[PDB]
Amino acid sequence: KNSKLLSTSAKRIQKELADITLDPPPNCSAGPKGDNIYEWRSTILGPPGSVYEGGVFFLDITFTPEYPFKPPKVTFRTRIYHCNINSQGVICLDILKDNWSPALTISKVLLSICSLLTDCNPADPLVGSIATQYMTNRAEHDRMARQWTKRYAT
After folding, report:
1. Where is the composition biased (Polar residues)?
2. Distance between the two ends of the chain, CA-based, in angstroms?
3. For residues 24-60, b (16+ Cβ closer than 10 Å) or e, as one string?
4. How far apart are CA 154 and CA 148, in angstroms?
5. Is the link from the previous residue into 65 a cis peptide, with omega within 30 of 0?
6. Rounded to an integer, what distance in angstroms lies between the CA atom of residue 96 and that of residue 124?
7. Distance between CA atoms of residues 13 and 67, nearest Å
8. 120 is catalytic
9. Can you tell me the distance from the alpha carbon of 120 to that of 109, in angstroms, rounded to the nearest whole number?
10. Which of 28, 92, 114, 120 is catalytic?
11. What superfamily does domain 1-154 belong to in CATH?
């Protein structure tokens, strides 16, 4: 193939790969799994000071062919006890749903995920039982979250 004919989504993803190589978000890395620019993995170390500290979390990231005009699909592959992340690893984050903009980048998405790990949104939960426990019994929520981090993410 003549690289002069690379698609606009492939060129944009390559630029975001360079960006994230030179200046990754704290406690994050991400890039293509292999030779397909549209299929990435990310590693997130649980934020220090949070209930996820010591955990190593793996995420799958898939870019669509019309990137940056649709958000990437980002899922957790490691189990995590968090009221905005379900058992299938789906992430309830508005910029991945109906509030995406083409000025956002995979680095900003990963920054937002890290912020969500440290500060969840219990009023828009994917896992209602966890949101309720966060609200009514935060100390037991945190015990559980640290237990799952040790059991499933170390």
Report:
1. 1-6
2. 42
3. ebebbebbbeeeebbebebebbbbeebbbeebebebb
4. 9
5. no
6. 14
7. 8
8. no
9. 15
10. 92
11. Ubiquitin Conjugating Enzyme (3.10.110.10)
Quick one: resolution in A? 1.4
- Please list the residues that pair with 82 across neighbouring strands: 85
Q: What is the 3-state secondary structure (H, E, C) of the chain?
A: CCHHHCCHHHHHHHHHHHHHHHCCCCCEEEEECCCCCCEEEEEEECCCCCCCCCCEEEEEEECCCCCCCCCCEEEECCCCCECCECCCCEECCHHHCCCCCCCCCHHHHHHHHHHHHHCCCCCCCCCHHHHHHHHHCHHHHHHHHHHHHHHHCC
Q: Kindly list the domain boundaries of the chain, sorted by start residue.
A: 1-154
